Design a protein around this ligand. Structure first.
Ligand code: NI
Length: 341
């Protein structure tokens, strides 16, 4: 049944709650972003109002074939009325089109639902600064102190320099980047840019990218694999067998693959710096796992919450075990005591 942490008290609203059938008493279904665990259950047969960003609305229409009359896109950073309740969508710094939602309840309570986010100090100067938030529904994916990772910028720098060195040493090397959802486009776009290539990909992936309002996108991507030296493949094919196979498909145009797997966290982060990352190599194939995250680190999450000073926190991730729930509640209390709210 719909869990309580997907329901917004005092409204008829749910968030990211499309796989429970008809939720009893729900007048509007919000969708924070186009990732499968969140949209699971939507299709062309859905007949309730869906509220989301413009980009998420492009993907609903084009990829899932939801009918237009049920898609209600909202502009960001703008006070809007939905079924008699004031709401605002804010940028979540996750994947393209991903938002956080502020709800202003009739009784005067103010609720922020983060959806999926990567907390950033720039959020401290949005419309959030302007009033108090009583309740926070929080993306707790990496709510534990072992979870450190570099900035997105440092990671991209590493990848650009690595790729550029490799292809300049060997002009017959191919670069491959794995993907399995939207997000992390910067990785393959930045590499293609330094190499003066377009990124080549399947027709399904090209369609998905054309929904995302990325400026100058027609200049950066293509379905002609033959004219590109940066290829995108399913994350599943980023392994020695899948890459050898793919190399055979290119008709002796290339004699070496350099491949990137943008993972979330991996335990080499506990010890190793970005400068120090090394690939796994077999023959003429090398695979780099790079820690490019679109979720808050533990420290970024802590800073956001200590800034916001919420009266009550409701976690939306890692809620399935008592040991996780208990550990999270302990961190929330430390943070509260340290900051004095
Ligand atoms: Ni997500």
């Amino acid at each position: 049944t719909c869990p309580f942490y997907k329901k917004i008290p005092g409204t008829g609203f749910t968030v990211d709650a499309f796989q429970y059938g008809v939720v009893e008493g729900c007048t509007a279904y919000f969708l924070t972003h186009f990732h499968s665990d969140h949209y699971a259950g939507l299709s062309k047969h859905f007949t309730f109002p869906v509220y989301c960003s413009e980009i998420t609305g492009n993907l609903l229409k084009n990829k899932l074939h939801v009918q237009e009359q049920y898609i209600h896109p909202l502009p960001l950073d703008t006070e809007c009325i939905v079924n008699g309740v004031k709401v605002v969508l804010l940028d979540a710094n996750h994947c393209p089109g991903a938002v956080m939602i502020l709800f202003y309840l009739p009784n005067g309570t103010v609720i922020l639902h983060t959806g999926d986010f990567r907390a950033d100090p720039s959020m401290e100067r949005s419309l959030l600064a302007d009033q108090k938030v009583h309740m926070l529904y929080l993306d707790t994916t990496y709510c534990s102190p072992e979870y450190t990772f570099p900035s997105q910028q440092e990671v991209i720098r590493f990848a650009i320099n690595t790729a550029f060195e490799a292809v300049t040493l060997n002009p017959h090397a191919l670069v491959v980047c794995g993907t399995y959802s939207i997000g992390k486009e910067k990785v393959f776009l930045a590499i293609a840019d330094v190499l003066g290539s377009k990124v080549g990909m399947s027709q399904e992936k090209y369609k998905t990218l054309q929904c995302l309002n990325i400026p100058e996108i027609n200049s950066l991507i293509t379905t002609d694999m033959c004219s590109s030296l940066v290829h995108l493949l399913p994350m599943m094919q980023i392994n020695f067998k899948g890459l050898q196979s793919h190399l055979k498909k290119c008709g002796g145009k290339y004699n070496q693959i350099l491949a990137f797997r943008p993972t979330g966290w991996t335990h080499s982060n506990k010890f190793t710096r970005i400068a120090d990352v090394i690939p796994q190599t077999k023959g003429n194939i090398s695979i780099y796992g790079i820690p490019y995250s679109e979720h808050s680190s533990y420290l970024e999450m802590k800073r956001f919450v200590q800034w916001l000073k919420p009266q009550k926190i409701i976690p939306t991730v890692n809620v399935g075990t008592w040991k996780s729930r208990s550990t999270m509640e302990k961190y929330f209390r430390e943070w509260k005591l340290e900051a004095g709210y």
